[model samples]
Target: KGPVPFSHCLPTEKLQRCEKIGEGVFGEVFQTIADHTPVAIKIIAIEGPDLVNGSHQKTFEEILPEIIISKELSLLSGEVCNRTEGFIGLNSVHCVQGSYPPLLLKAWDHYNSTKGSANDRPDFFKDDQLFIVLEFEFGGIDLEQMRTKLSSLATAKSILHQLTASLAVAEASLRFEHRDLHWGNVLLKKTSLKKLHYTLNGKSSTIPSCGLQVSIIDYTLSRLERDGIVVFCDVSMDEDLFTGDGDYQFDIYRLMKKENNNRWGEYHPYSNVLWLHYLTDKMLKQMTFKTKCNTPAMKQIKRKIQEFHRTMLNFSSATDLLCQHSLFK
Candidate 1:
């Protein structure tokens, strides 16, 4: 009925805090390479009036939600955690590489240096005071970058087919929902030449090509609201949670509905999707550009963003907290 502590879930060897990659409000992320494998570790520095007493009860309580989520995920995986139903399943097969980097601070600093004199001053780079660790990609990129280079609709179709197939493996096989499926959360891995060269040369390549694989991360804000009522939002989970027409599978569904119908459709053309795909593409491009520029207009930009969703989803009447999320809102 309540949450459990994760004290025994400590890393095997003291995590040798690798290079700090990201700095968030709670903590920082470190590139942790243990053995031959690499992972981004999120380290949270817990501080509160109740924590100075030395007992970690407060800290434990704070992280209970994450622990519960982890426990639920662990249930899906088999021995070696190689297979899971939801996000973990994707992690097992494809997460071997790592995550894509968030908008970096140094990049922001560079942008500011180039910004010539302006009437309005901006704070592009926030101070890096983090205590968390997050692992990112070693030799891979995100699907968006792939989309940019492989701009052909045919190519997008092909690659997305692979991704959808991967999604299928996660859904029907694992019986879990990704709850989040966007370009950002998905990372790439090197594809082995063995798989490819074997077809070309009648044998595997001596030097393995970085086989292209995929990994999905960030379940901190995921939804597990199966009880009809959403936890943080006002929408019910049992509604006809589709974006477009509820007829087509991938037409253009809202972010939240996409999560729900993770493995439902088998058809190629997802008609009547929950959201408008073209608008979604446009908004994502705009946001990504702002991120690259390290714009300090987070508040204004974020505010304008919800407007995009409202128009695309055609949800002028829905005013629930769930609708506020980029996907649902």
Candidate 2:
């Protein structure tokens, strides 16, 4: 419940920190190995004296909701009421204080040298500065990165299917709405598994894996509930997030804002459906695979996607559409 020294929580001497793989609004991600286990660690500055990533850092109290939501979703894989492997596996969280670890700083510097970094250097953090370290299963690269390699109709189906099915289970169990499900937030990891299992309302469902697994990440804008507690970050007050043009990703933000009626609190699974529509558009137009685009099977899959995209919004929610099994041939 309180912050401790980072060195105590994660001893640099015990970890083999590798490359800095990602950066987001809240923090940066570093690939690290400990106890022969590979993991991705997202370090978020909280209640820091200085601004992080060009904005004020979240206070300790404000960051609790995000941790709650993430932990809730990660626990769903074991729960019989609802389950899916589509969400990122959040392993553990550390409320650590003091400056950023030296390994992370070096990795970040290397990351900046390799590719420009949007976040400020953590070297400026004061020794007393606080951060919440999120230890996660090494969620794979974003869907945007794997688009060119998603070469089959089955590949596309499995990707979309896993995501929507995950959302439906979350919707059925937690009233969750991933209001910001952009392509960048969907992580795809290659696997040898042939199929994945999902349990919605105690009903088991399986989807073809195509040697790939989907894991949704970044819950900064996600909404969920547990018991009498409901957690949601009100996007209505965040004007910059809604001001955008071009790209279905931006449009989805606008649509989500509208569907929530410029506020965020109540569960609106329409937002989840909007994200699916955006995914369909992205895979169809921009992120195409190596297969022949003009072939009959490709045409069939394209029509299936368009067909659902055309009919997605009119439905009541993601769970409704998914329950009816209308997303495929």
Candidate 3:
């Protein structure tokens, strides 16, 4: 089923454009100011000739999937923001009907002046010729760069702890799976700049006082769980038609052996958990600096990190086992 419409279009004049901040195969992202608020706007070009044989080359039907997925994800973005901490909030999603290779807009809160490992870049680029705009909170630092600047093992643990919790919540409560969970998709916020608190089960809780927060961006390859099954959000109604691996997509179906077909199965939930854990482990490794054993506390920290790696090797599909582990706790 398609998502219910939850956003509307805005005029071009409503936003004041600024310099380009990020770019990818799909399009370029520009910083902009709207009503005195700083926002990052991603503009993606829609491909096609304006006219073909006295008619427009591209039609809304041809690119309806992109439009639907973008709008639906934007609508669902608020649910993710509510269920987890550190997810960027969307202000609006804009689209105009009947405009060839039309421009789309998504506006959200922006953060200013932050440092990170890499420039913000998107994961996938759809070749649809409809220029689209996705706006989000600006000034997010890259997670890999943030790893280099981490000053202590305790701080690194806290950061990893929160990230684990966020991903766990995404998988369990939100029933959402981010297919791409790499360093680039992870954003580390500035220290103590703002307090992020969320209400769960009608009770509000704030993040720990250590003060580093992370934002998981890019949902192009994300999937949602519905009716007790995980399914790709961007595809048409046939959930069974999806590819076996999270990275592949199937446009047509043919007869094949059960073993030959890579279909979504019980492996997703288990693998998703491990995927983020692996990335977090890599981040932890980056935070450690090799040197002579100087202090007892440092020794203990290194030992704990080693144990964390060892424990990960024994992970299984048991949710309680993974969730109750000391690393996440």
Which candidate has the top score in lDDT? 2
Itemize residue pairs with steric clashes in candidate 2.
none
* Whole-model lDDT values for every prediction: 0.34, 0.82, 0.48
Better of 2 and 3 by TM-score: 2
Candidate 3 global lDDT:
0.48
What digit string (tens of lDDT, one per residue) describes model 1 on residues 1-329? 22212211224342333444332333334454555766555544332332221222124344443434444444433423223222332111111111222322233233336632221121221232212222333424545445444322322322322333333333332233343344544555555333211111121122122344544544443333322322221223334434446232234345444543543322212211122333245334532331232345544444444454355344321121122334321
Question: Could you give candidate 2's per-residue lDDT for residues 62-148 as a string of tens digits?
Answer: 788788889988988899978887888887898887877787788889889988888888889888888899888887888887778
**Which one wins on TM-score?**
2
Candidate 3's C-alpha runs over 4 A off are 1-17, 46-82, 95-129, 191-209, 226-261, 265-267, 287-295, 316-322
- Give, for candidate 1, the lowest lDDT window spanning 10 residues: 90-99
Clashing pairs in 3: 46-129, 46-130, 46-131, 47-129, 106-135, 109-137, 110-138, 116-142, 244-262, 244-263
Clashes of each: 41, 0, 10
**Residue 51 error for model 2, in Å?**
2.1
- Per-residue lDDT tens digits of candidate 3, residues 117-176? 122322222333344456676647667656566556655555555555555555555455
* Candidates sorted by lDDT, best first: 2, 3, 1
